[PDB]
Design a binder for this molecule. Sequence first.
Ligand SMILES: Cc1nc(C(=O)N[C@@H](CC(=O)O)c2ccccc2)c2cc[nH]c2n1
Length: 167
Amino acid sequence: VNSFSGYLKLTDNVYIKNADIVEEAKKVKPTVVVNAANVYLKHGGGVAGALNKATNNAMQVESDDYIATNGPLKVGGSCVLSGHNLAKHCLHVVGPNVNKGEDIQLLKSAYENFNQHEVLLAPLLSAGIFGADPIHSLRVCVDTVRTNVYLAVFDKNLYDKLVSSFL
Ligand SMILES: Cc1nc(C(=O)N[C@@H](CC(=O)O)c2ccccc2)c2cc[nH]c2n1
């Protein structure tokens, strides 16, 4: 039993909800919140910009120190950093950005990072400003993640499409 509320069960381990991941994280304080990161951890917009704003820019400060020490992530890769006031940990995961021309086949590799954590709150990787088809991303999530994933979907219209079209 966990604290997530109001989710629709898609499979044994994948759940979905129309919700703001920022407000959801603040309420649940999950062990792991997933950020839709880029390889430079520049949290300027989309989910990353929103998560970082909620931390009063502390996420960005921590991220800049991480990059200065370690260099950029790989597309498809991840790192674990602090969750600040939102969660215990933030798993920064780099899905391919279609608007940069990156291989969508890397979306599966990106979702594989979720399997290192028993329970996560997360967005659809590569959705939104990353330009991928969210129906394809939900499909990859369901077919790749084996741990318990709670998806927050910001747009009410997109969610209903995701639920109504889910196989
Ligand atoms: C869960 C979540 N998602 C996003 C986000 O950018 N979401 C994409 C995908 C989607 O609909 O979830 C989007 C695509 C088209 C229109 C609006 C949003 C944000 C931004 C701030 N907080 C968030 N929380």
